[PDB]
Design a binder for these strands. Structure first.
Lengths: 111, 44, 89, 50
RNA sequence: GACAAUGGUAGGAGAGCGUUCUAAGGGCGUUGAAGCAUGAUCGUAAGGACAUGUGGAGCGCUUAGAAGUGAGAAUGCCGGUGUGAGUAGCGAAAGACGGGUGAGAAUCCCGUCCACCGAUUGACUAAGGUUUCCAGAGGAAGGCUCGUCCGCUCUGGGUUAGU
RNA sequence: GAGGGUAGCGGAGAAAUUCCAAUCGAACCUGGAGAUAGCUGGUUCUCUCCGAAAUAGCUUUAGGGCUAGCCUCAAGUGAUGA
RNA sequence: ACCGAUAGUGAACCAGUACCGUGAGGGAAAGGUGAAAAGCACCCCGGAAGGGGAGUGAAAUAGAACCUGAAACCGUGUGCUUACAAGUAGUCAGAGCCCGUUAAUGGGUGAUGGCGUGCCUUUUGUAGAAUGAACCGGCGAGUUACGAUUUGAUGCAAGGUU
């Protein structure tokens, strides 16, 4: 079986989250948890909470053992941006996109 | 750098106020033209 | 209209064929609450819900049949009478 | 200067080939049982014992 | 059935496809309308069908009628989304440690040491703003980072004249 | 500093065509007004038949126009065509 | 034989309003759950946001960022191919490898060989280093009234007709 967990409209640009999602995709579960704990990136705690959620749905929602699961999928999609501005020299004003993201994680026991 | 707008209450109400517009004849026309449009501020 | 305290029969819906008493009436939208009709379950308690007054028909006091209602003037006032029979209802 | 011409998503995806991070370089602490960074202290309940 | 002819701009002539609406006739539809996605189908072209998924109530066919009738290009208007690219910048300047609080602390609170202005970055008032002032809570957005904090959000308060 | 004045066919100027709300060889707004433009740009579906001109004359005319010349459709004449 | 939310009033919404200007004055953009709120009791991860269930419902990729949900753009997995090669990026020929359709001289990929300097506008002549366009979607240009003339149709006819 597979369990899944999502986090929607996380306020971090998607191509900043895809950098650290690529380190834990494929690894074991207890290894990916330590990887997310010991990395400098600002998006580490968010992915760690989403991963722990998908590891907790497995124990209760569909009974299975949490010492066998592997991160079968982990990806980040776009979400609605925010449109802000920055007033520059000589009257001009430039745009600012505050990107968001949707982080999905699917953990499977290989069965 | 001194800019073009220095706010001041007396000058604002003494040039663009209701009484100033209701005083002359082309100010009554400005009010009669702003009332027709539906503007919520006739003079200030 | 259909005033409450009246025994009606449900002509349409998924309760059709039943019959109960009119409890409440919302005549700004033509809704009436019947007893035992349109039982809804809300988050879990179970109640009745309104049904459009176009759907319930009054029962003849004579033959227990759904009919229409007309009005007559027996005196200086109005009286409701069934369409099949002619008795006040 | 300004780009003379738009960048394909082939050229962009090639140039982002080496833009990544690496695994934190971690060991397993032989007191905490848990994982830790080599030459650092055990961030879990524990010490260094070096 | 025999013979010939068939490159083409500007432009001239003919025959046609498709779109929205109307009249009359004949139909389909919750046993699933239009739309929309796919397919390895048909026609000389414009274009026409059929099957599957979805969707959730309308829509084709025939013959005529009437037009806001078919768009790749106007430094075209409006909306969305990219590339440059994790690139330039992050707005004049001295902070260091200790102890707290907290899910989370270089950035918030308290403390000691150090540093800056001191004819001023100190004190008081006229314009001008017009509730931004205080206490208790908050952390979505604003703050060029963080934030447990604030001139920001919520809830209650605060302006006292015979001179 | 405060309170006032001078208004666009106008005002102020120790004068520089300076300055009159980041605008001045004549402000800004609304209307005449879809001013006009012999100039540049553009023009939204297919197939079938034919298929040029870049020349003469006149022109306040010369990158515009009008008539003739060269193209096309229909009716007629009819051997006048080459 | 009027429009149907880029249309129809500038305004189907609490619009002549946010706003913007010293002022006179200028001016948007914003529609849709379901038949009925029955608008998710309760359990679990999390500080909350947000999920995963289980329930309401005919439907929850109907959960108030609510009908449908497309293109540009951003990703995840995979079938064939690619690190000695000079590429308007296709077309024609053609091994190998993987599949199996509206069933028909089948679909996908492409080792290698031949041929091949985009589109529009403006020009005697542009691959042109002459112009325009970042891409996608919607909007967008020979029309109506009244007269004149020529052609096809129809009715009467030394008459035709208001």
């Amino acid at each position: 079986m597979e369990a899944k967990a999502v986090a929607r409209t996380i306020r971090i640009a998607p191509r900043k989250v895809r950098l650290v999602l690529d380190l834990i995709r494929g690894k074991n579960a207890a290894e990916a948890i330590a990887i997310l704990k010991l990395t400098n990136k600002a998006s580490s705690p968010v992915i760690e909470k989403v991963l722990m959620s998908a590891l907790a749905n497995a124990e209760h929602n569909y009974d299975m053992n949490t010492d066998e699961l592997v991160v079968k999928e982990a990806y980040a999609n776009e979400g609605p941006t925010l449109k802000r501005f920055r007033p520059r020299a000589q009257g001009r004003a430039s745009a600012i996109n505050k990107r968001t993201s949707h982080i999905t994680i699917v953990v499977s026991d290989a069965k | 750098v001194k800019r073009t707008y220095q706010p001041n209450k007396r000058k604002h109400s003494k040039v663009h106020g209701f009484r100033k517009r209701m005083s002359t004849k082309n100010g009554r026309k400005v009010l009669a033209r702003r009332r027709r449009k539906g503007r919520k501020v006739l003079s200030a | 209209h259909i005033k409450k305290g009246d025994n009606v029969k449900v002509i349409a819906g998924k309760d059709k064929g039943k019959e109960g008493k009119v409890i409440a009436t919302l005549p700004k939208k033509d809704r009436v609450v019947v007893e035992g009709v349109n039982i809804m379950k809300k988050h879990i308690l179970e109640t009745e819900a309104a049904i459009h007054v176009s759907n319930v028909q009054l029962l003849d006091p004579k033959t227990n049949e759904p009919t229409r209602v007309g009005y007559k003037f027996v005196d200086g006032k109005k009286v409701r009478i069934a369409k099949k029979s002619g008795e006040e209802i | 200067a300004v780009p003379k011409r738009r960048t394909s998503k082939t050229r962009k995806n090639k140039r982002r080939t080496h833009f990544k991070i690496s695994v934190p370089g971690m060991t397993e602490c032989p007191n905490c049982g848990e994982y830790k960074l080599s030459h650092r202290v055990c961030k879990n309940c524990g010490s260094y014992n070096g």
